């Protein structure tokens, strides 16, 4: 697996998002905090260009929203239908497509950054009409009700991936691991670092 | 020839239809009532569901205790039907070339609903574990169970999850990333899905009536269905996939079916076949007003009028959500293998708007068929259509 990766952008929580100006403020205000992060980063990495396929990646999704729905359900109350419909794991991909009017085909994965890149490679290598793939990872920490919950700053990270003249090679993909998007950004932006123990090399 | 064709070397499909191949075929060929009533999913109401009414393995291996759940047990119950022959088959490939792409919309959430209720009612000092309910847990648990070392990851795109997993495995093979891919999906019944879809008024008051004149929503089902794909020939091959996004509404389909029609056409194109060559379509056919009106419009756009046998099987399996596409692919495979029967559509009065199609009213197949299509149209306007052939 060798890829050309470009336009790497890592976004953290912000009081306002420049990229989201193209979305009318009424709908923009109804995006969850995590939806704002993901959509902002997707637009920013695209940088006015387009993609032939979008791979959205999130380990947890919006677990906070699912928790509130579950409280109602487990209290024998009927949950909010708009909350439920925007709580599914691919809700952000659907929100992006509607609010940015971009019907580009997409998928939503629960996996690490490396597997998102593997899915992108497979799309590019097997499909002649797919020449650019956008990969967008996002996550926020788990509700502290869960035993494994650990705080980290919520984030989205996106990049545009193509096949020709690769600058990235993936040499291992069974650990996968902590091989998350933040670790990748650290590796990618360190000009002196050519290899990573998570199985990435620059080329 | 179809350049993206991949062979279905092994397959398994557990659902309300049964747990043995002969039972499942008879359930689809006859007006068997396969759904079950449940009084413990929605408060103050019974629902018909597609329940797997057979025992699950009472144990997960020791090294996988942390991720145990009914959903995983369902998955391992299905996998063990093919595991022995699969291990004999994979011996001749390198371990790093055995890959896994599976879909789910529930993972093990059902197992945490009890603890979360107790948390919300009083015992505010319990520690609930989150990983058994994460979507990625499915592919990683399966990987650990089989000892495979290729990529393993989970697709979670609501109703299209497992159909997209089949298409993903086809790509992995023709991108030279794997020589064998386990694909499919597993969803289990839970309060979250039943009450989530109830709040959208998407559930039928009784048994669903796909394309019916007075249809009133869906029944939810659970299924565990897997396929072992390789580049080698097999009795049935996955030949084409078509994927589109409606970009219309977060929970209602494009009313002209533009996304669904394009997905179906792209599947035909990738398979290198014309609409005329398809002998049967397994509809998405959920029995909501919006879906069936949209879908039959799209079918008429691509296939015309009275040209192709079709049926929904969601009155038999229920709408299995993340697993819908996989269990429906399994049905499509058996149809092509047997050259004998088609799955019955619900015996209902068809909506006059939708009646200009050849709904399967009797199971006998009278002429051989070479290609079959199956549709999955999900939330967020995620559409996929799969084409299978001999």
Numbering used by the authors:
A (entry chain A): 2 to 204
B (entry chain B): 9 to 398
Paper passage:
Aryl polyenes (APE) are one of the most widespread secondary metabolites among gram-negative bacteria. APE biosynthesis gene clusters harbor two ketosynthases (KSs): the heterodimeric KS-chain length factor complex, ApeO-ApeC, and the homodimeric ketoacyl-acyl carrier protein synthase I (FabB)-like KS, ApeR. To understand the structural basis of the functional redundancy in the two KSs, AbApeO-AbApeC and AbApeR, from the APE BGC of A. baumannii, we determined the crystal structures of AbApeO-AbApeC and AbApeR in the absence of substrates. Therefore, the two KSs function complementarily in the generation of APE to enhance its production.
In the crystal form, there were two heterodimers in the asymmetric units; we focused on the structure of the first heterodimer (chain A and chain B), which had a relatively lower overall temperature B-factor than that of chain C and chain D in the structure. The overall structure was superposed with the X. doucetiae KS-CLF complex with an r.m.s.d. of 0.68 Å. However, AbApeC was composed of only one thiolase fold domain. Among the conserved residues, Arg30 and Arg31 residues in AbApeC appeared to be important for the ACP-KS-CLF interactions, because ACPs are negatively charged proteins. The cavity of AbApeC-AbApeO was characterized by its asymmetric shape because of the lack of cavity belonging to AbApeC as observed in other CLFs. The cavity was lined by residues from both AbApeO and AbApeC. The volume of the cavity was 120.4 Å3, as calculated using the SiteMap tool of Maestro software package, 2020–2 release. His268 residue in AbApeR was a part of the loop sterically linked to the loop containing the gating residue Phe391 in E. coli FabB. Inside the AbApeO cavity, in addition to the gating residue Phe387, residues Phe85, Val89, Ala166, and Phe205 near the entrance of the active site cavity were strictly conserved, underlining the importance of these residues in function. AbApeO-AbApeC had a comparatively stringent Kd of 7.4 × 10−8 M (N = 1.63) for holo ACP1. However, the 6EN-AbApeO-AbApeC model indicated that the bound substrate entered the cavity, such that the full elongation of the substrate up to six conjugated double bonds was possible, as observed previously in XdApeO-XdApeC.
